Symmetry: C6
Subunit: 153 residues, 6 copies
């Protein structure tokens, strides 16, 4: 459980992200696919992208990034009371996309790296500590649902 | 032990399956053999089938699917009081067919995937949770019999 | 410890076996050597047999099967009070033949398969459960003697 | 927790190091890169250096050594009350440089070897014991931050 | 600890062995070297022997067998009170010959096999049980000394 | 902790060693390097020695053996109260020579073998037991210092 103080550090940096959700989505994507190329194989819609240039130019990948960050933002804004938001996401990612927990760890790593680069003034050690805690909370509850749905993860 | 509420979610989606048992049987089969080809080797009657086309055309495989789902349906409708129904099934599958528990897990996975595809309105996160729980109950009791009969599983 | 009820299920099917001990001995043998060929290597008297045809024709192998089943029958009829019968068998099999417990498991598996094939009316799930329990009792006590005699098994 | 006596042994030898921070920085560097060449790969600014001669001649590597030892000195002088000093160092080394704990162990080993060579009169068994304890304290608290920041280390 | 009854079974069969110590020594030797050829490598005095024929003909190997069995007999006759007899044997075998416990297990196995072959009337299941227990007692106390002397065994 | 009786057995045989420290040093050396050639690699001053003949002829290796045994003798004569003597030895062997505990075990083995060969009348089972205990005490306390100094060993 996160403290109100920790939630504030998270929502304060997220308000900066919201100033340009599409741009933030792109940076996270490229970071993820360059650091862990195997994840790209899960996207039959984007697996043909070869270079960073191609990724940056994909209008579809950009739109998907916005969809992703918007869903995550709705979750964070619930400050732990995200049961309703997690159910449909756990179902699709476990049953249709088949995304293991290890990959959620990788994208969490990408989110932190991008926030650290673009928002150093609002992403100091304590702020990163809180964001990490929030994402670990997310993964802990998703992995829980995964088990209930019958997917090891 | 499942709650009455959980059983209801299971029987509600199963009533949809019963509207076309043969068609549901076929989809589960193809899904199983494509996802885990090694299972096909256990069926000396169907191991010669090479493609999805051939499987879809096999009148015998279709009939067997109905026999399978009918037996499973009788079990689910007992809501946990399935001792009598499990004995003969555990004996044949342990002693004659020699089907390991790992393969029952694979077919459970196939059942969930097919229900999720054909009945999204009646197979939400909670419904899938209940169905998974019912199938895990099935496997837990079968594995138990397996041990009693002298088969590791 | 087996219940009187369990012993009855065992002795009831064994009375059928006794109607043709020699034939039952042969079926068990062929089943064992085909399923686990390595066991044949322990019999310097039968290791030259190449096919199922040759095995079925061996008058010596047939006679040995009768000797084996007769010894086992005497044990089962003691309903757990088989200490005297086990000593000489554990000594020869541990010290002279050098038969590991793993091989006693294999022949137990062969006995069950043959009874299941030839006597389905008297070898239902409960009956098989009892027979398995009786054979596991046998192996448990033999393995115990093995240790006392200085053979790991 | 270190005793006041142990801290004194540490600060007494460190006062000698401060008489020539740049020279001490160089010796530690060369010792580290020769003993564990893989660490050099983390420095994109120095990874091109091939020999000890080149390292000794690099004006940039010399300047960096001073920056490093100065930061470490500030930490040691806090005698355990180094929370504020550790936060920014853990953030950069975990998130940007990605330096595993194993590498902090290697540089700790290099520091001890150099002090042992240049200051034997002030680096006896007890003194080395205290310095080791101080560096293990450093690593223990850094590894702790690493976890909070989301880096395994 | 062995019972007086168990000791009697051991000494009763040993009195038969004493009727021909040299012959018993030879049988044990050949059995050991044929079953576990690696043990022969420890005897620089006998490692040149190639066949069973050569072993049976070696006058020196025969004499050594008598020396061995005589020492073992003196131990068994002490019925557990063999501390004085074990010290010099543990010292030479641990420090000079370097004989691991695994090899004492192998020769124990050879002793049992030979007694079983030559004295079936006095080496039934109970008798073998007692002899095994006596030899395990021997090995347990020797391994203990080994540790005290500084040899792992 | 060793008893006064055990210390006496150790010091009694050591008084014999002192009658020819140089000769004893040489025998231990050759035994060590022949049994465990890898240890020679630690001595940059002696690693060029190829044969036993060369070792026996090295005046420097002979002198070093005396230095070694003299230091060990001073330790043993302290009968457990060797804290002051161990500190400088642990520092050099951990930090400069980098000698793992495994190698101290090897030289302990060499010491015992040589005493057993040259002094059988004063190195019986009990005497060897005491000497082993004294050397294990030595290694236990050295390994302890190693940890304090920051060397795993
Ligand atoms: C921060 C974590 C994540 C969030 C909040 C998230 C969110 C979403 C959302 C809202 C959708 C659209 C609706 C749906 O299908 O449920 C989606 C689709 C998808 N997600 Fe995720 N996702 C996350 C991580 C991942 C990761 C790490 C992978 C793969 C390595 C993944 C693979 C997919 C795929 C394959 C789709 C379908 C895309 C398409 O074909 O249109 N997701 N995700
Ligand atoms: C949902 C789980 C399952 C149910 C309810 C089920 C049910 C049945 C039923 C009722 C029969 C006919 C009667 C009998 O032989 O007992 C049967 C036959 C058989 N089952 Fe299953 N089964 C299940 C899973 C499997 C799996 C996963 C395998 C193999 C990977 C398997 C292999 C067989 C075989 C080989 C036969 C014989 C088919 C033939 O040759 O005619 N079963 N099963
Ligand atoms: C149900 C378990 C078994 C029973 C009741 C049994 C019984 C017997 C009996 C009564 C004999 C003759 C007397 C004797 O030597 O003790 C015998 C001989 C023998 N048994 Fe078994 N046995 C069993 C399992 C096995 C197994 C699994 C193996 C090998 C894989 C084995 C290998 C032998 C051998 C090699 C002989 C000697 C045959 C010859 O050369 O004449 N037995 N057994
Ligand atoms: C005694 C432990 C260490 C201390 C006190 C220390 C201190 C520092 C300081 C103060 C900086 C500059 C500011 C910053 O980036 O945070 C720095 C930069 C850096 N450190 Fe460390 N560091 C330590 C160990 C290491 C080790 C062992 C590695 C790698 C094996 C490492 C890799 C780096 C890198 C790559 C930089 C950036 C250099 C550049 O490109 O300019 N550090 N470190
Ligand atoms: C029942 C167990 C054993 C007993 C009672 C025993 C007894 C003896 C005795 C009394 C001696 C002569 C005096 C001495 O050196 O201590 C001896 C010598 C020896 N033993 Fe054993 N021993 C046993 C097992 C073994 C085993 C299993 C090995 C090797 C695999 C072994 C290897 C040797 C060697 C190499 C010698 C020296 C022979 C020579 O070169 O003359 N012993 N043993
Ligand atoms: C009974 C255990 C040992 C004792 C009492 C001992 C004692 C000594 C002493 C007193 C010195 C000289 C002063 C010093 O450098 O501390 C020394 C030097 C040294 N020792 Fe040991 N030592 C022991 C075991 C070993 C072992 C097993 C190794 C290596 C396998 C080793 C490697 C060295 C080396 C390399 C030197 C330096 C020699 C030179 O280059 O002059 N020592 N030792």
């Amino acid at each position: 459980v996160l403290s109100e103080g920790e939630w504030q550090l998270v929502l304060h940096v997220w308000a900066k992200v919201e100033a340009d959700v599409a741009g933030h989505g792109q940076d996270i994507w490229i970071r993820l696919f360059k650091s862990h190329p195997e994840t790209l194989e899960k996207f039959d819609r984007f697996k043909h992208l070869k270079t960073e240039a191609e990724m940056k130019a994909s209008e579809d990948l950009k739109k998907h990034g916005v969809t992703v960050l918007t869903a995550l933002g709705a979750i964070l804004k619930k400050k732990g009371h995200h049961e309703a938001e997690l159910k449909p996401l756990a179902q699709s990612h476990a049953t249709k996309h088949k995304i293991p927990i290890k990959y959620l760890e990788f994208i969490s790593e990408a989110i932190i790296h991008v926030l650290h680069s673009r928002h150093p003034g609002n992403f100091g050690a304590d702020a990163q500590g809180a964001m990490n805690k929030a994402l670990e909370l997310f993964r802990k509850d998703i992995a829980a649902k995964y088990k209930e749905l019958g997917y090891q993860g």
